[PDB]
Each structure stands twice: as structure tokens, then as C-alpha cells.
Design a protein around this ligand. Structure first.
Ligand SMILES: [Cl-]
Ligand code: NI
Ligand code: NI
Length: 291
């Protein structure tokens, strides 16, 4: 048809039409990644907006991808005509039938106008406790996660939207301290089970100052190591729960385990003083976080 999802990509490829003219997928992805890293640096320095609505969501997307996509500010249900003449739109997404689905067509607008509406009626979640803010914020995050408003680049723009929302609301949400892996698990959990717990967990680690400092310290130890932890899920141990794995060492404020490819961080004071002594890197340890 005249308006098609296939018009987003270069013919006989899967690599999105972009301002660099790069048809090769890996060449494009590197350039997109390099340029959008630069845009983040500047977006973080701009003043927080007076209103948190979809217009602001779009501004973040527009500013991140202004040098990459001609449709930088654009929601995916709106027909977009490129400089090349072809018109693109993707109201479907399409998963396999057995997977959970994203929004289709007019639902995008409905769902986005709904977010706009609740952030207006609740004054950007502004006069709230952490518990209240988080509880309301998770609902909106998940709602926006299933709307999948842009053809691409949802993750970054969504994380910045919510980090800035938190800050304006008198609270914190350091998504910087969350790997691409953890987000995915937490997202998939909501989409399939309706299980909020991994996201509740995620938001808690990222907002509770006592858990921020623990993660901050651990993420520092990854700097200049030559590694990438972004494939690996990192967490602070849930209260009450019991983890068992191999000891990756201690710091001033906290320590780290390895549990089936995942890094669980704990407060150093929650260790029995006497274990802390004779614990060399590699030791198998079981650890139950306290109340
Ligand atoms: Cl993204
Ligand atoms: Ni066509
Ligand atoms: Ni450059």
C-alpha cells in the first residue's frame, strides 16, 4: 500500500532509513549509538519541563534522534512522508500470535491522551511520598511500555522522561544504574504474567537512597575494566529473600555475589562480622537479607 510499515526501512534490508545514508546495519547502529550518546549528554543539562505530557516525551525523542531519523519527534501511528517520497506508519508492530501484544492504531493515541490526562489531574505526581510516587509511576511506566509509541528509540526517551519526572516530583529514579537485561526481565514479567514484582523491585533499588549508594559503588568497579555489564542483571538483595552463589568481593558500603550470571549486591553490615573476615573471592556463600 501507499502508507506502509515497509517504507521505514531500505529495500532488501532491515536497516532503518536514516540521515547518514548508511544502509549496512552495524555501520548505522554504531553511528546512531555514537550520536545519541552525544545528545543525551546535552538533554540531561536542559531544564526540566513545566508539564510532563506526550509533547515532552516527543521533545526528548526529537532531541535524541534529530541527527539520525527524519521522523525524530514522531509517534508511529501518524503517517510520515520521507524526503524520498515514500510514506511510513506502523500501527501494528506484530509479534508472534502467542506473544503478548503492544497497542494497535488508535489505542496509541487513546493511551497517550490517558497518560497526558492523569499527569495533569495528579499535577505530575508532585505532592507525594516515595511509596505513593513509585506506585503511581510504575502504572504509567508499564502503560507507556505497552504503548511503544515510537518506531524505535523508546527505551532511552522513556527512561529520561521518568528520571526527570522523579526529580521534579522531589524523588529519584536513577535508571543509569539499570542494565538493559534487568529492564527487559521486569518488562517481560509485566507483559506476560501481569507480575509487577520485578518492576516494583527495580524502582525500589533506583529510588531508595540506601540502595542507590550500593549500586553506585558497584557500577564504579566496572569502569575501565574492559567489560560490559549491560548484558548482566544487577540488583540489590530483596529484604527477607535468600540468595546463594560465589563471592565477588567487598567494598566500603556493600559487597557483591554472582548468582547464575546475575550480580546481587548486599549491604556490608548485613554480613555476619565473622564471615566478612575469612571470605576470599570465589567462596560459596548463602545470604539472607534482613527485614
Ligand atoms: Cl532506545
Ligand atoms: Ni511500498
Ligand atoms: Ni562524533
Amino acid at each position: 500500500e501507499i502508507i506502509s510499515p515497509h517504507h521505514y526501512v531500505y529495500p532488501n534490508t532491515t536497516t532503518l532509513k536514516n540521515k547518514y545514508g548508511i544502509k549496512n546495519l552495524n555501520a548505522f547502529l554504531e553511528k546512531c549509538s555514537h550520536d545519541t550518546a552525544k545528545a543525551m549528554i546535552n538533554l540531561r543539562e536542559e531544564s526540566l519541563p513545566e508539564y510532563f505530557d506526550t509533547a515532552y516525551l516527543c521533545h526528548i525523542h526529537q532531541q535524541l534522534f534529530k541527527n539520525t531519523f527524519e521522523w525524530a519527534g514522531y509517534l508511529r501511528h501518524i503517517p510520515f512522508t520521507f524526503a524520498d517520497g515514500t510514506t511510513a506508519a506502523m500501527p501494528e508492530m506484530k509479534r508472534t500470535g502467542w506473544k503478548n501484544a503492544f497497542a494497535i492504531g488508535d489505542e496509541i493515541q487513546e493511551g497517550l491522551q490517558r497518560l497526558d490526562q492523569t499527569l495533569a489531574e495528579k499535577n505530575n505526581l508532585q505532592g507525594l511520598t516515595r511509596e505513593e510516587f513509585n506506585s503511581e509511576a510504575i502504572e504509567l511506566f508499564n502503560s507507556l511500555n505497552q504503548l511503544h509509541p515510537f518506531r524505535e528509540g523508546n527505551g532511552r526517551t522513556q527512561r529520561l522522561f521518568f528520571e526527570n519526572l522523579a526529580k521534579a516530583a522531589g524523588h529519584q529514579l536513577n535508571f543509569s544504574l539499570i542494565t538493559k537485561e534487568r529492564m527487559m526481565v521486569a518488562s517481560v514479567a509485566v507483559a506476560e504474567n501481569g507480575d509487577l514484582e520485578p518492576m516494583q523491585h527495580l524502582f525500589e533499588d533506583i529510588s531508595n537512597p540506601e540502595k542507590i549508594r550500593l549500586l553506585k559503588e558497584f557500577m564504579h568497579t566496572m569502569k575501565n575494566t574492559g567489560r560490559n555489564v549491560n548484558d548482566r542483571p544487577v540488583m540489590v538483595a530483596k529484604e527477607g529473600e535468600t540468595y546463594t552463589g560465589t563471592y565477588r568481593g567487598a567494598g566500603l558500603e556493600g559487597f557483591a555475589l554472582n548468582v547464575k550470571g546475575a550480580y546481587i549486591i548486599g549491604n556490608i553490615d548485613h554480613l555476619p562480622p565473622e564471615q566478612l573476615k575469612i571470605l576470599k573471592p570465589g567462596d560459596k556463600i548463602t545470604f539472607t537479607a534482613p527485614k
